[PDB]
Design a protein around this motif. Structure first.
Motif, short mmCIF file in Angstrom:
data_model
loop_
_atom_site.label_atom_id
_atom_site.label_comp_id
_atom_site.label_asym_id
_atom_site.label_seq_id
_atom_site.Cartn_x
_atom_site.Cartn_y
_atom_site.Cartn_z
N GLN A 159 0.80 -1.22 0.00
CA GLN A 159 0.00 0.00 0.00
C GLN A 159 0.84 1.28 0.00
O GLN A 159 0.40 2.32 -0.49
N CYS A 160 2.02 1.20 0.58
CA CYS A 160 2.71 2.40 1.06
C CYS A 160 4.14 2.54 0.54
O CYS A 160 4.76 3.58 0.71
N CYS A 161 4.62 1.50 -0.15
CA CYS A 161 5.95 1.58 -0.77
C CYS A 161 5.98 1.83 -2.29
O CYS A 161 7.03 2.16 -2.83
N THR A 162 4.85 1.74 -3.00
CA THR A 162 4.88 2.28 -4.36
C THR A 162 4.40 3.73 -4.47
O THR A 162 4.93 4.49 -5.28
N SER A 163 3.43 4.14 -3.65
CA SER A 163 3.02 5.54 -3.57
C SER A 163 2.96 5.89 -2.09
O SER A 163 2.76 5.01 -1.26
N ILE A 164 3.13 7.17 -1.77
CA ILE A 164 3.28 7.65 -0.38
C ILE A 164 1.92 7.55 0.31
O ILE A 164 0.90 7.93 -0.26
N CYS A 165 1.91 6.96 1.50
CA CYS A 165 0.73 6.97 2.37
C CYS A 165 0.68 8.22 3.22
O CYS A 165 1.72 8.63 3.77
N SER A 166 -0.50 8.81 3.36
CA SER A 166 -0.66 9.96 4.28
C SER A 166 -0.57 9.47 5.72
O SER A 166 -0.59 8.26 5.96
N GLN A 226 -3.66 7.49 6.45
CA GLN A 226 -3.48 6.15 5.95
C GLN A 226 -2.59 5.25 6.84
O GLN A 226 -2.94 4.18 7.17
N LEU A 227 -1.45 5.78 7.25
CA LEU A 227 -0.65 5.18 8.30
C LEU A 227 -1.38 4.85 9.59
O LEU A 227 -1.22 3.80 10.07
N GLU A 228 -2.20 5.74 10.06
CA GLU A 228 -3.07 5.48 11.17
C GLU A 228 -3.89 4.17 11.13
O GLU A 228 -4.19 3.67 12.16
N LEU A 231 14.40 -0.74 2.71
CA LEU A 231 14.57 0.67 3.10
C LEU A 231 13.25 1.40 3.31
O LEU A 231 13.09 2.13 4.29
N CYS A 232 12.29 1.21 2.39
CA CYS A 232 10.96 1.77 2.60
C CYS A 232 10.35 1.30 3.94
O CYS A 232 9.83 2.12 4.70
N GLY A 233 10.44 0.01 4.24
CA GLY A 233 9.88 -0.54 5.47
C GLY A 233 10.48 0.08 6.72
O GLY A 233 9.80 0.32 7.69
N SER A 234 11.76 0.42 6.68
CA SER A 234 12.38 1.07 7.82
C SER A 234 11.79 2.48 8.12
O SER A 234 11.51 2.83 9.27
N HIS A 235 11.56 3.26 7.07
CA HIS A 235 10.91 4.56 7.19
C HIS A 235 9.48 4.42 7.58
O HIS A 235 8.98 5.23 8.40
N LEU A 236 8.82 3.39 7.04
CA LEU A 236 7.43 3.12 7.41
C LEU A 236 7.25 2.87 8.91
O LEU A 236 6.36 3.44 9.53
N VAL A 237 8.08 2.01 9.49
CA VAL A 237 7.98 1.83 10.96
C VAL A 237 8.21 3.09 11.79
O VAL A 237 7.56 3.30 12.79
N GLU A 238 9.13 3.93 11.34
CA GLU A 238 9.45 5.22 11.97
C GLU A 238 8.22 6.13 11.90
O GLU A 238 7.85 6.80 12.88
N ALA A 239 7.54 6.13 10.74
CA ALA A 239 6.39 7.00 10.58
C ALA A 239 5.18 6.48 11.39
O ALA A 239 4.45 7.27 12.02
N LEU A 240 4.97 5.16 11.40
CA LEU A 240 3.96 4.49 12.24
C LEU A 240 4.17 4.76 13.70
O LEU A 240 3.22 5.05 14.45
N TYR A 299 9.29 16.79 9.18
CA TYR A 299 9.35 16.34 7.82
C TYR A 299 8.07 15.54 7.48
O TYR A 299 7.42 15.81 6.49
N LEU A 300 7.72 14.59 8.31
CA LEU A 300 6.55 13.74 8.04
C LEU A 300 5.22 14.52 8.16
O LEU A 300 4.32 14.35 7.34
N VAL A 301 5.10 15.39 9.14
CA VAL A 301 3.85 16.15 9.32
C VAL A 301 3.59 17.21 8.26
O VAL A 301 2.48 17.33 7.74
N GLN A 347 11.68 9.88 -3.56
CA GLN A 347 11.92 11.28 -3.15
C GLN A 347 11.55 11.49 -1.69
O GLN A 347 12.19 12.26 -0.98
N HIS A 348 10.48 10.82 -1.28
CA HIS A 348 10.04 10.85 0.07
C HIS A 348 11.09 10.28 1.03
O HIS A 348 11.31 10.84 2.10
N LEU A 349 11.69 9.15 0.65
CA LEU A 349 12.73 8.55 1.51
C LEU A 349 13.98 9.44 1.51
O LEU A 349 14.56 9.70 2.55
N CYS A 350 14.36 9.94 0.34
CA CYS A 350 15.46 10.86 0.23
C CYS A 350 15.28 12.14 1.10
O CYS A 350 16.17 12.49 1.86
O1 LIG Z 1 4.32 5.75 2.17
C1 LIG Z 1 5.27 5.96 3.10
C2 LIG Z 1 6.42 5.15 3.13
C3 LIG Z 1 7.38 5.42 4.09
C4 LIG Z 1 7.20 6.45 5.02
C5 LIG Z 1 6.05 7.24 5.00
O2 LIG Z 1 5.88 8.27 5.89
C6 LIG Z 1 5.08 7.00 4.02
#
Ligand SMILES: Oc1cccc(O)c1
Ligand SMILES: Oc1cccc(O)c1
Ligand SMILES: Oc1cccc(O)c1
Ligand SMILES: Oc1cccc(O)c1
Ligand SMILES: Oc1cccc(O)c1
Ligand SMILES: Oc1cccc(O)c1
Ligand SMILES: [Cl-]
Ligand SMILES: [Cl-]
Ligand SMILES: [Zn+2]
Ligand SMILES: [Zn+2]
Lengths: 21, 29, 29, 21, 21, 29, 29, 29, 21, 29, 21, 21
Positions: A5-12, A15-17, B6-15, F16-18, G4-7
Motif C-alpha cells: 500500500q505504502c511503498c509504491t506511492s506515499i501513504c498519508s 493512511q498510516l493510522e 529501506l521503505c519498510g524502515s521509514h514506514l515503521v518510523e512514521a507508524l 518532515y513527516l507532518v 523522493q520521500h525517503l530521500c
Molecule cells: O508511504 C510511506 C512510506 C514510508 C514512510 C512514509 O511516511 C510513508
C-alpha cells in the motif's frame, strides 16, 4: 499489506493510522 | 537494490510517530 | 515522557531489523 | 513490557526478539 | 522555541503542525 | 548528555513527516 | 516519489547536523 | 539507562555523513 | 573515546571528522 | 549515486545494532 | 564490499556481522 | 530546489549548507 500500500506511492499520516493498535 | 527493505524502515518510523501510545503491529506479509 | 518517546523510536527500528519477515508488535502500554 | 525492559537498560538482540510476532 | 516546547513533554502531530510552513 | 541535540534530530524527522509538501523552518533558539 | 520521500527524510537529518545552531529551511517544491 | 546507546546511534549517523567515501571506524571502549 | 568525548556534550562535525578513516 | 548513499546510511545503522560493543569498520570501496 | 553485497540484495543481520570488528 | 539537486545526485556538505538559515 502495508508494504504494498505504502511503498509504491506515499501513504498519508491518516493512511498510516490504519495500522495503529 | 534494496528498496522495499529501506521503505519498510521509514514506514515503521512514521507508524511510531502516528501511533503514539496506541502502538502498532508491523506484519510485512 | 519524551525520553520514552525517543527510546521507542530506536526500539522499533531495532525490532524492524531483528524481526525480519516476522514483523513485530510494538505495545508500549 | 518493552519500555520498562529495554529503555531502562540495553536489551540484547535475543531480548528484543521477544517482541517479534 | 520548538526544543523548549517539545523536548520534555511529547508534542502531538497536531502540535507539530503549527511549525510547518 | 546531548539530549537537546538528540531530541532535535527526532523533531525534524517528525516535522518532515507532518508538514509534507509545505516544508518547514527549523530555527533552534 | 516514495524515493523522493525517503530521500527528503535523510536530507532533513543531514541539514540538521550540518547547519547546527543556524537551523535550516526545508522547502521541497 | 540507555543514553549512551541512543547517543552512539546518532554518532554513527553523523560519522556516515561527515566521513563520506573514507568511511570510519566505530569503536566504543 | 567517541562516547566519552561526544555523548556528554555536543561534538561538531569537524570534531567527529577525527574518527574518519 | 543517491540510492547507494541512502542504503549506506541504513547499513551503518544495522552494523551499529548487530556489532554491539565490538563496533565496526565502515569502508565503501 | 558491503555496498556491493548489501545494497543490491538484502543482507541479514547474520551476513552483516561479518563486517563487525 | 533541494529535492531536485540532492535526490538525483549526492550533495556535498557545502551544497547542503545553502539550505541553512
Ligand atoms: O508511504 C510511506 C512510506 C514510508 C514512510 C512514509 O511516511 C510513508
Ligand atoms: O535497549 C535498547 C533500546 C533501544 C534500542 C536497542 O537496540 C536496545
Ligand atoms: O515532542 C517530540 C519530540 C521528538 C519527536 C516527536 O515526534 C515529538
Ligand atoms: O556529540 C554528538 C552526539 C551525537 C550526535 C552528534 O552529531 C554529535
Ligand atoms: O542489505 C541491507 C541494506 C541496508 C540495511 C540492511 O539492514 C540490510
Ligand atoms: O544528496 C543527499 C541526499 C540525502 C542525504 C545527503 O547527505 C545528501
Ligand atoms: Cl535519542
Ligand atoms: Cl532510504
Ligand atoms: Zn535518537
Ligand atoms: Zn532511508
Amino acid at each position: 499489506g502495508i508494504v504494498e500500500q505504502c511503498c509504491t506511492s506515499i501513504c498519508s499520516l491518516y493512511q498510516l493510522e490504519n495500522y495503529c493498535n | 537494490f534494496v528498496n522495499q527493505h529501506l521503505c519498510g524502515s521509514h514506514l515503521v518510523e512514521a507508524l511510531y510517530l502516528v501511533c503514539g501510545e496506541r502502538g502498532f503491529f508491523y506484519t510485512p506479509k
